[PDB]
Amino acid sequence: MPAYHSSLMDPDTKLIGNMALLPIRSQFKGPAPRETKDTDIVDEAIYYFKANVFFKNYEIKNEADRTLIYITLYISECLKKLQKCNSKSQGEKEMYTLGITNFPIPGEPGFPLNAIYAKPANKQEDEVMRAYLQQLRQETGLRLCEKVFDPQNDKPSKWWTCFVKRQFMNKSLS
Amino acid sequence: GRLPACVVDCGTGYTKLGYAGNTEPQFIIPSCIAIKEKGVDDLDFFIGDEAIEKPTYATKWPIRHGIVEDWDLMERFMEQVIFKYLRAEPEDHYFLLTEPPLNTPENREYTAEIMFESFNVPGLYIAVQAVLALAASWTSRQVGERTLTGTVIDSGDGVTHVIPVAEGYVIGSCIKHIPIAGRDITYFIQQLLRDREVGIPPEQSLETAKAVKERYSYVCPDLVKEFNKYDTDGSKWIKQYTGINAISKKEFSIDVGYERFLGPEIFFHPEFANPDFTQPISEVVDEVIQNCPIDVRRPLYKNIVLSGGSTMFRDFGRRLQRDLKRTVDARLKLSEELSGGRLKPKPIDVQVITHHMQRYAVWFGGSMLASTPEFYQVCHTKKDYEEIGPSICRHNPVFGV
Amino acid sequence: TATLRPYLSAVRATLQAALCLENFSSQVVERHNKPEVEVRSSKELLLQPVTISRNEKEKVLIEGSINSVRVSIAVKQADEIEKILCHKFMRFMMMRAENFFILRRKPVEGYDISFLITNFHTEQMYKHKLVDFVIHFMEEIDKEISEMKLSVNARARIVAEEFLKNF
Amino acid sequence: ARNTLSSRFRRVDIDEFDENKFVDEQEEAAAAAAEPGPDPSEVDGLLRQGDMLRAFHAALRNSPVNTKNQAVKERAQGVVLKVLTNFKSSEIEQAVQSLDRNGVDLLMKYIYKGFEKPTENSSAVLLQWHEKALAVGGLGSIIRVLTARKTV
Amino acid sequence: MILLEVNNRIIEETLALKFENAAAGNKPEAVEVTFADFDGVLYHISNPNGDKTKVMVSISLKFYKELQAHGADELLKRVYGSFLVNPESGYNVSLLYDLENLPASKDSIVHQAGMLKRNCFASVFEKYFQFQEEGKEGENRAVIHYRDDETMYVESKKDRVTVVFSTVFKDDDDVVIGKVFMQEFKEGRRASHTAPQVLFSHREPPLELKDTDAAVGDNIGYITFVLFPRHTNASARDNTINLIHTFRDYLHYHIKCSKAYIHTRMRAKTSDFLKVLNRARP
Amino acid sequence: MAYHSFLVEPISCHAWNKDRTQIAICPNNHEVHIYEKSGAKWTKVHELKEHNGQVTGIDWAPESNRIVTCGTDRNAYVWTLKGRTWKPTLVILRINRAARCVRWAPNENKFAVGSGSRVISICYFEQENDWWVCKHIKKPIRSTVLSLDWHPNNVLLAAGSCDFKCRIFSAYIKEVEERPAPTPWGSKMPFGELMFESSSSCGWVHGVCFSASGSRVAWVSHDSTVCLADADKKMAVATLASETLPLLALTFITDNSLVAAGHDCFPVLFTYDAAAGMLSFGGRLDVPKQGLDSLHKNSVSQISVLSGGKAKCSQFCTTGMDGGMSIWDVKSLESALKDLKIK
Amino acid sequence: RTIGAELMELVRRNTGLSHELCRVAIGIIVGHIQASVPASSPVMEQVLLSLVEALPSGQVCHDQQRLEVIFADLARRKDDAQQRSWALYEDEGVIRCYLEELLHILTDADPEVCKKMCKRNEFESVLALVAYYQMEHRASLRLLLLKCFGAMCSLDAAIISTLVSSV
Ligand SMILES: Nc1ncnc2c1ncn2[C@@H]1O[C@H](COP(=O)(O)OP(=O)(O)O)[C@@H](O)[C@H]1O
Ligand SMILES: [Mg+2]
């Protein structure tokens, strides 16, 4: 059967490059509009993370799938740093520092999906992309730390750090 | 007096022996052979349960995907099956063997080349495994109400097959053959635990994965909803398995989590293990039946017989019977729309039954058969071998000419 | 019962004479490319058969053609226990004929083994090494049988001791 | 699967009754009267006195290649094959070196015919003959045995 | 496994399952099992009259009339005793083990249940082994048809017991290898000096049996066993009988298993040649 | 004495352009790869992909620059270089079996294809439909045709077959040329007339080449018997039976001497004396290299004349099953072998 | 222009020397022909400078080829689920041969080759051995892997972060 795709795409949803500039519920600042609903492109990708890393074939139906694939690849970067953390406060400090890092973007080397992603043509669209992703890289990390850490010991769970070796298909943002 | 026939279902995991006429086999042993690590030294070997425990011997598994790979060992595996366990003088007893559908002809030829020349048997019949499993179900069924028409799903350790049967005749050109089975489920649990639960010795990872599979595992209605149930309410769904080390004799314990439903899921998401296969078994069955003649599509949906040890999973038919009825009630809906909506066609009565005998279903259909007189007609014979040669056993129903 | 050096010297020369091959498309079927020595539809493309022999039993038969050669061989079998071990040995050599690319899955009638060498083997494989395999076969086969006859006799003693010792 | 229609038409072979089959040519002049071949009394009278080297050339002078008859060929083979078997092993190089090219090729034809049906010691001799004729005539002598459409 | 086992697995396996269940207090489970052994033997384990507490090990030897003679009816009684009861229908002997009236130390009655075929053959040997010890000569030989196309002649003398097998080799590849195996039994007294003497007449029988309607053929084989009193005495007649009633099957076991040794060795030499050809592959 | 291994597999056929600047090999496949001579290197420039089967014969017309191919798919294609790419042009051979050889004519107005259909197809152009229609010559022939060569009159044709013969035919096409001048081979040369049929009937004729004078033709056989017929001497044949493996292709370097090559994996030379009326072995040409002892490590299937024509050749090319192409320099062999003489 | 690097590859192939002693042997030979034969000093000094101070375009080192062949089989033998948990074929002698060869390369060859082929594709080849170690139970092979890990830690410190963060 197929993997889990994004249901949130709507024709009224803006496009950046060939991705889906979708609303995000965050206190962080960026080009992403603020959402009112109780579900977002982030809460989905965290719902569907543990299941989508076992599949080996993903068919890109729309552009919101290109936004989900990015997060699902970045969550595997959070867990590499979080498994080394001994307290949630130490994780939130590590999740900040990682989002500030300038990962590759569509068009340049490092990005594993340069072919099936559309780079920004103009410089203004480039500046919007680098600030949309950084808004995802920050709210993703902030929301994992609520889940990874067992409140009984305030230390990472083996049920999340078992997916450290499970890349999305085999790709990584590095 | 007149002697019954020997029956042997050499499978990937377990091997089923005995004589005809009986209801359950006289032996059920793993398909292993223990050898040392010229002269009479090729006879220092053990098979079955006498092979696992042997410390100074190397355990070998000569069968993969139902087919044999090293006939140097299987010729030694069969000369203890006969002379040690069964204690049969093969020049007197006929024989019934089993093959999967996709067994090559050259393996059927080397089989008969072994039994007829080396062991000098007077007869031999190489039957299809899952077909015998359907005859067994008919005895559980009422007498006279026997349904000759039925679909069969036989999944063991090596490979999984879907075989339709209509009015007694096998529709061989519509068979499917899914390479996913209990060995792929086991190596997938053996993988998830190496990532999470270190503390399992490498010598006891396999023993630990079968134990989890046979006991704790099950089948889920939806995958991602189970991950939440294991996360949100972990005390209820996470079990614990205490083992015993074999060196220090100290216990080791682990937490049994996502591998309870992820192993069996590869029946429905087989790209978890094998990237060369994506289609679920719920869809393979629909193509098997929709490729069959239009008149025997309904009776085949109504008798889907699960056989094999890797269909013992809890709630396996409940999901297969549900993934089909979704697929079948839609197709009838679409046709009702294209026609004009003037006729509401009759619904199809899907039924997936899971019969009481599974560990020896195929053997049982071979014992009922061998106890007949009709068996002694279709059996290839020593005389027919000397004349025609080992190509007498070259053909199977899966192909023509 | 002549000698072994000249026998292999004759066979080696006849083989170099008969491995003068080239591709050749068929003239009875549209675009087939078969070895004409096997199908034998075109008599003109079939060279003569020539035989070599140390004696009545041992001999070689080179059936050549424009695009194929067939080298049947008869091995000496003094006693019955050698007829058996040679018959099995070829069966286990024919079963792996997809790995011996120059081999027939059955032998010519009257002979114990038969090779078949097409014009695609000489283009790919080294023509002079294929000959050295046929020759190496013909002088080692006698050694590899007596080594089995001696291995059967050694086994029969242990099977006797392991029974009589218990008395 | 299996078929249930008459498939017997695929058994009969029509290629037997074909008009494009190859036809090799024969000598018309020899069908009426065959070449007499080496007469036995000629060679034999030269064998009684031990003149092997001349009984040798007498057998290779006449050869019924153009003859369609097989007995005179067989009689001819038994004559020359009787001669080669009686030679002295040291005298063979003396005899082979005398022959012209076209006699060495005809010799090697008769040699590869002696290997077909051997006596007790007919082949240990012919392998020595084969060594000498090859030293003179080379592989090209054998090729004119393979390509030869007319047997000896 | 070089030597064949004399005690059947299915009986020792089946009874010990019942005997370990009942003595654990669990309830009895039914059973109906038909199976076989060598020499045309046919067993039958059953719950008689449906009584799941009783199990009845029967057996159907042909040639048992030859064994009721020589006093095997008494030999078997001296072993099992109470367990021996009236024969089941179509069968020659029938034991009966009561699951509620079991003794402790069950491994002895189990191990004796597997040896039922042995205890039947063990009469004709103990009778003739005693004749040598008593010095009785002039008694008649014992013709036993342990198979339809085979026969076992026994005979006793002052200093030796002579045991003959009129075996048969179906294929001609077996009679060729068989001469090799028997040609080394004859020389078996070179290593094991105390061992019995063995002989082998290919087609024709010996002189002791030419009058006795023996069979001749290009595939038959006559095999003799000369047993001296260091075998037939009371301390060794058990282990001697445990080997002699398995000889015909020991010989054929190793003819069929020698082929696998040959096959096992040609798959290797074939791979040695295949290294020489791959020299031609660039 | 060069050796450039284009590949490891055979080279069924080859052809050179006028300048000898480009070469068109078939690397044992359905494609024709055109390589250009850039200095001391070889660079591939084009690849012709139209055949449904293996190629067996190629010829390059020097003036028109029109390549013609024949393959096992019962097809031929006439290629014209339009701009930067080669475009084919269809051919109608009308043969039920596969083709084996092709040769352009001297005047480039026709070509002849030899096939396993027991025929030879004389092809010419038809602008009415852009086709190349063909006429057949299949009167005496009884089996496959292996080689061909054109007389300098642009009419007469020689053909070596597996019928053990080297016939000579008149490929006169009235629509494209006037009647020819007479020749010592005969005056009566209508379409499809057997002028000369050889006498030998042992061995398959692999190669055939006409002499520059047009009065001498030689042919090689699998019987290890080179031959040569002279029309001035009433079509008498002179053989020279060799003592080695056969030859597979020949060509006249002069009016008297030839060069052959084949399964012996090197070239040789053959000298003709019409005074005596025989051939003589001119010795091996390539020196034994300082198992095989030459450049070609397998057989040779095609020999061609680059420089000097058949009148007096200075360089000839060999193309073999060892994926190789060796250029030879004739005078360098004269110098490197003081015993060697080219008559 | 590139002699000093094309000679070291020739010498390590036909001698088996380490990287260090490959440069010593050339510096000694050259430095001695320069001194004994002053007529050749200009050529020799260029050759020495090529050593003190890259390879041709398509030319690839021998040690780099082997590490493509070794890391590829050991990862193929890791992904062979049947043979690991359900053994049929013999593997101890082949694996012991590839791990010995690996240990002589990491220990002797140029570290920058053995660094990049281990740092390639985010340490894909290192992390496999780390899993094959977890999967293997035979101490004859667990011991050679340890000697190989101990040689990979000496090359770079990014590999140490990869192993310690692993299982
Ligand atoms: N309760 C169970 N649940 C799931 N699998 C089981 C159960 N019991 C046995 N099995 C599996 O059945 C498999 C063997 O199936 P079977 O068909 O009997 O043998 P084979 O596969 O060799 O033909 C084993 O791999 C075993 O793990
Ligand atoms: Mg099974």
Residue numbers in the entry:
A (entry chain E): 1 to 174
B (entry chain A): 3 to 39, 53 to 416
C (entry chain F): 2 to 168
D (entry chain G): 2 to 153
E (entry chain D): 1 to 282
F (entry chain C): 1 to 290, 320 to 372
G (entry chain R): 310 to 362, 369 to 482
Please quote the paper that reports this structure:
The Arp2/3 complex, consisting of seven subunits (Arp2, Arp3 and ArpC1–ArpC5), is the only known cellular constituent that can nucleate daughter actin filaments from the side of a pre-existing mother filament. However, when activated by WISH/DIP/SPIN90-family proteins, Arp2/3 nucleates linear actin filaments. Here we found that human SPIN90 is a dimer that can nucleate bidirectional actin filaments. We found that SPIN90 forms a dimer through a three-helix domain N-terminal to the armadillo repeats, facilitating bidirectional actin filament nucleation by activating two Arp2/3 complexes.
The resulting reconstruction (at approximately 3-Å overall resolution) revealed a SPIN90 C2-symmetric dimer at its center, flanked by two activated Arp2/3 complexes nucleating actin filaments in a bidirectional fashion. Our structure shows that the SPIN90 dimerization domain (SDD) is formed from three α-helices (residues 312–362) that interact through extensive rigid, hydrophobic contacts, with a buried surface area of 978 Å2. The SDD is connected by a flexible loop (residue 363–376) to the seven armadillo repeats (residues 377–717), while the N-terminal 38 residues of SPIN90-C are not visible, likely because of flexibility. In our bidirectional filament reconstruction, Arp2 and Arp3, which are bound to adenosine diphosphate (ADP), are both flattened and adopt a short-pitch conformation. SPIN90 and SPIN90* contact each Arp2/3 complex through two distinct interfaces. The first, as previously defined, involves a 936-Å2, primarily electrostatic interaction of the armadillo repeat domain of SPIN90 with the ArpC4 hinge helix. Our structure shows that the ArpC4 hinge helix conformation matches that in the branch junction structure but is bent compared to that in the SPIN90-inactive Arp2/3 cocrystal structure. The second, previously uncharacterized but equivalently sized interface (buried surface area = 1,081 Å2) forms between the N-terminal end of the armadillo repeats of SPIN90* and Arp3, with an additional minor contact with ArpC3 (buried surface area = 362 Å2). In this second interface, the interacting loop from SPIN90* (residues 393–406) inserts into the pointed-end groove of activated Arp3, forming electrostatic and hydrogen bonds. On closer inspection, however, our structure revealed the presence of lower-resolution density contacting the SDD that we attribute to the ArpC1B protrusion helix.
